[PDB]
Symmetry: D2
Subunit: 315 residues, 4 copies
Amino acid sequence: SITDKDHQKVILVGDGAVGSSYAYAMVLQGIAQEIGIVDIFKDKTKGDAIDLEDALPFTSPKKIYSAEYSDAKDADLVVITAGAPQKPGETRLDLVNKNLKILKSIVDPIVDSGFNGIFLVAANPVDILTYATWKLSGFPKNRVVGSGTSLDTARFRQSIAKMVNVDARSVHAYIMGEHGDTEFPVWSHANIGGVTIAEWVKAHPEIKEDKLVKMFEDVRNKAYEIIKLKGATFYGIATALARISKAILNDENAVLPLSVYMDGQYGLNDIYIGTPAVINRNGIQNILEIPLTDHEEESMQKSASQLKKVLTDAF
Amino acid sequence: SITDKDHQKVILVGDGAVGSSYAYAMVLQGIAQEIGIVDIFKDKTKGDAIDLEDALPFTSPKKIYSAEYSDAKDADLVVITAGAPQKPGETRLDLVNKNLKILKSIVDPIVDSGFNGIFLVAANPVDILTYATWKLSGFPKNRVVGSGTSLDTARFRQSIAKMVNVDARSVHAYIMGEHGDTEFPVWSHANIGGVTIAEWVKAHPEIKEDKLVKMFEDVRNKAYEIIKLKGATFYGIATALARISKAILNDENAVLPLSVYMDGQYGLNDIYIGTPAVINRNGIQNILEIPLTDHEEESMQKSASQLKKVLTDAF
Amino acid sequence: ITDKDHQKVILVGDGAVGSSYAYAMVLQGIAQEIGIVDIFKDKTKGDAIDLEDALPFTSPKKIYSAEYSDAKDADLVVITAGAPTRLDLVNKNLKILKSIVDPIVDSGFNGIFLVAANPVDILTYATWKLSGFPKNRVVGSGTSLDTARFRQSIAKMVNVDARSVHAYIMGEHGDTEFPVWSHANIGGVTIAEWVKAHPEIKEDKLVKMFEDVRNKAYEIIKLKGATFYGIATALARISKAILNDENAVLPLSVYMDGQYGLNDIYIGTPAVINRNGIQNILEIPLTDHEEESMQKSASQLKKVLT
Amino acid sequence: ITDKDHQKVILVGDGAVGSSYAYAMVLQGIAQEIGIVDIFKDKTKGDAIDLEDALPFTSPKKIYSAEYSDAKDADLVVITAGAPTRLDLVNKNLKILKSIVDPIVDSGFNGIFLVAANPVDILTYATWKLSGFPKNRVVGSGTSLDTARFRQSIAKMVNVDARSVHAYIMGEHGDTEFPVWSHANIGGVTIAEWVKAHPEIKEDKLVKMFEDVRNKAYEIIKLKGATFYGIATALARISKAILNDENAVLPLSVYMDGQYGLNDIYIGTPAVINRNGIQNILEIPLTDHEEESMQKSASQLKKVLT
């Protein structure tokens, strides 16, 4: 029976706060029917699995368990949240080698299991580890996806939303580039219910230009703020990962900002970097190329350049 | 890519009020990604398809269109709502032959398309047409499913719910048998939040026995009441069909009352009749056999007997 | 205080639209009580008890055949009662309006009016006039449905989830409505920018797309007698935005107090809506061509009001 | 009147439980405002703004670091603030309780208290005593979580959706709680009847199943330090039942006024709940063995209260 294929399975690799919250979000919203949790700390994963199971009588059913890489054989989706943090006194290049070593020992056993699905990558630095995952897995470009700037975009939209007092779902604005310090806002196409930010400021000159600059700076630094205040960040990214998962698993052809492979777009090549893209059950369908201003295009170039120098050096 | 199979497709046959409402329910609740609508009135189906499309920007995406039987090749689910009504002066046997002729001209082109999914049958008389569909399709017993007494059960639960002033989801009571005049309530296992109806009446003797009898009679006659008042019934059954669809498509292993094949249960054989069953992506997994009282078992026997006599005669 | 966490909608008009709206509300678990009011007291009883059968598969609701007096404590009164061009219905539908708004107000109703009967922008104005309610608590569906049609139309063409497509139809709902191509976009990329990247898409296709949208009701009626799923779904969306206090942006029939150079009419434009009705009216900066269209639509609308 | 369609929850205690509860509420779009109150004012700011990042993917909410005074107009106050047996926490947690309920009541709060701090049935009673609120507007999570664990446990065993499995744990949440096997069932078929049909299922398995349920918190803490997803999800379920006026049946800490021969304690039993808190207390007819267990649980509980 063809309906035997109506069982969706996600293997989650990494059971820190992010992975754990992602699993909870998936449970609460009833996305996918099976979640296997893989982490070097086997006790912690057993612990989360059976704590999450208690939620199921209040939601839809799911098979949730502590898993092994071999459990990915028939998974639709492999979500990687396992990245080693940058220790003080390491260079970005060192963070990258330390994490490539680890990422290899995940991707290789996963591919060897027979996994033939989509890789969703959220471990930091995400655009680099997304490229790495593509390189190590041999999967097609469009079946390796990074969260990229989805979270920064959400932060940006919510920030604007609060300012103008509007549901953030009616606010459309992007952050693009490498997720991290070189990311940048796309003010030129940002809007609220179709009305652009430029047009909105003209109607509401109380809103000073410097406020908007601060708003973005605050967005770029939001992770640092959160870590200062409570030790780690996780609810945002978890939620974004769930959103992306839903878009793939329900074949939505949704537009989201994501780490995708550049094949000429923005004058870029052979890197993963964050931009709006159409995504569905088969991964990336289209990469939207926003026509940027000169300033904005420069920012994209600078972001891509530093990113690319680091990739080359790392291999 | 294995995720290419994360696209769910339903072919709906019959675009009367029931089929049309079923399609709307599926759209509103975002169940399945594709709905093809098949009916002898091609204009009406085009009309519904494009009226339903207008709802999509407020819900999840779907491919919805006027379809042909050949469009079932890769469908997960074929839902049959096309039954000719009983004209005055026809016998039940005649209603059955008239509908077998029609049902043949549906099931044969569907099977010929390559359809390899699950048949969900709701056309009346449903337990007979479910058997017919099994016979004509050659599909396994457990991949041919009728709505059976799901709707009567819902009516029964809501009826009790109103009486005791409780959310109907906390009320658990079945109607079983052939959907129609010979169906019967399973008072012995009916309960509210675990407390049985017997126990509830003991605590609340204001509730007279005759009230409960009337409550069931009203349930059995509810279709007639609705038709008297507004011409046809459709919201209930549509909703039930959507529920069943969700259980299959999300592989729930849900318990629902459904038309299922009797292989000894209740002392019955070689008919489809309504009973609680476990259902998932592969159709019927288990048939629950409720231990009935003597009265209740008699009712089941009588219901099955008249039903079976009609089947035999019809072939 | 939690005694106030019970939401109640009185639906007036139990045709296909109203009936479908009720079903949508049931399926998506919006509001806890629905009263259905119509001339045909048997038909409303019939729908009420058919809809009740869905409740064991959704959240609970009190659903019943209702009277205008049942609106005393309603949050929401939704008016769908029309006769079966949308302008050719104006006098027939004002007569029906008149008989509804007065008994509703007399009941003590102190909520929001949501109007969907055609011609909607006129009947919305009428409803404001007859009710004496504030401007911002009388809301028409306006061009929400046309906008949805427009988005879906674009979505199909470019093969993208309609929720990622942002484009408006504004003006009077009906023949003088117009598309706002200047601000239409897909995931932020404008239609102009999209066509440049995808020149397979010819300019005449886009014009046809809009014409088809403007005639869609007629096409549907030709094919199946009436239209209802779209508008029902839109009404449910608007109801949810009010009842969950969303501050959502939607195209709606709202009162013009200067916007676009317009005054003392209800006409369709993007607006922010929440539990207290209309908060803001968004004023899209239109092109000259687009502004002309808005003016013509408004002019012709104001003539008919008289 | 629709000005009252804004639902507000004040959450007290921003540990893993409270934080997860907030997330659950966000993800499922329950309530429109969440204030978070905790000793650690930095941690609550941290969670508030981390949770805000989820809102563009869900419905809108006002989420912020709050003070007890922010409860003036809240619908719901949820108390999760505990020290890290569940009885060995009683004095430490009463001290914390004391410092919460008084400022909340003093703010003008006139809603429902939902209590989840351990030991829950004791702290629920305490909360009633300290607040002076009516019995039925002070609600403890009680054995909702144990019941969920029990259902899920059974569900896994018989390979069925837990929502089709109906079985309770009642009594004091903790060591003296007990299963109500007499009324436990799967799709109406009782556990007794199920075992008869499936004798592979041995009696000692069922006993182990319950023992494992009763020790599940300890198992989880052994494995990962704390438990939170289950209780958070249960609290969200209870919140939804109140805020959407469901009249849902759930096992909860409720005041005994004679039921089971018990008096003047809160203890866990099935109850009907809606916007006004507890409407009915269901009194399951227990077997002799089961009633004994309920009595022992209640006795031991009443001793500790003193």
